[model samples]
Target: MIGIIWDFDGVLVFTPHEKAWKIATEMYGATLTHDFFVKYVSGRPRYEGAANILSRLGIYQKLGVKTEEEKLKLLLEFAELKNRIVNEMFERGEYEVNWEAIKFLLETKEKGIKNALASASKNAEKLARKIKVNNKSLLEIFDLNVSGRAETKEDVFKLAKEELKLNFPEIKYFFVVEDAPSGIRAGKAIGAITLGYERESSLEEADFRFSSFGELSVDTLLSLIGGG
Candidate 1:
């Protein structure tokens, strides 16, 4: 069956760099610049994103933030702050939904397509549950929440495809949606139809790039992926 894979973070949610970075700096005594968040955190897991911050500051070795237990508590605190900020931002109506993309997903269900989320966060399921995509009349989709977090983008796709038993033919029609360059590379490497969504610039690796999912119709997406 045809499939659609999606990334979370910037693809589904628009996070303000200032709000998240301010909380992170206050909690960790770590100051993060806008470019820092763009380079390290925007589309990655909490721990890795935090680690990258520490690594850039040359504090990972000094803080001894090695164990999962040590990392989780610290990261969770940052996550709590980040989520509070994101939720508040959404409440302010500062963010826009890719209603266009949502419309395509809805239509995909009508066409009997399969969809899934491939996020690296252990909190992915919680986020998906919070978002309510699964409750809708959408395509059959399973998020990484079921399988848990994968630290790297490569491993994320590996576990996801294995769980779904995805083949190349299906992969071609499958759309792996993401905003990061790294994620695009992973999806492209797997021979999936990699759609770079709502990002500033195009990564040469992505098969499609769009500013707003709201801008494209279902037939447009299908045609881009060679599904139609």
Candidate 2:
């Protein structure tokens, strides 16, 4: 059977990254743009993203924080602040499930393929609970779920192999659908088929690219690698 692993934030749900960035600018008076997020934050854990942004924008230097430990502490602070902002938005019912992803997931399941979620977001479960209120669609659709809290994207393939009891050869096609370059790279690291969705940025490393959800399907994905 084919096994598909998905990234949560941009791939499945339109995360509040723009809002989070806005909050950052409001809280710290630091300049940030969508390009910054795409480079460092898009598919990375919150702490790493925060640290990259902080270091890049000279926040730590401005504060005279020289040590890595101190930088990490401040980065954690940023992470917590961003999480709070995102959670508040979640509570306000601001996030929505990507209907195209949902449709593709359900259709793939109907074809008896195994599916799971591996996300860089620490709040994956919380966000899933909030958005999948319509009969726990996420919990029901995905056979297994792994979040950044459990492992980094670099370890996702190992986690999926162990948890799903999957042999590499058994998977006719192992597809990793992602919107970030980091995620696409992770999939490539594990030798999976990397499918990129066009967002604010492009993933030139992806094996294939699609502009929208309507352009993706299990059959077309499999065809790329001669799986069927």
lDDT of each: 0.63, 0.76
Candidate 1 colliding pairs, count: 1
lDDT of 2 by residue, 13-113 (tens): 88667777568756876877878877877667677778888888888888888997997788878888987888887778776678888788888888877
Give the alpha carbon lDDT tens digit for every residue of 6-33 in model 1. 7766676554545655565656666777
TM-score of 2: 0.78
Would you give me the overall lDDT of model 1? Answer: 0.63
Model 1 alpha-carbon drift over 4 Å, by segment: 16-18, 27-31, 35-100, 133-149, 166-172, 225-228
Best by lDDT: 2
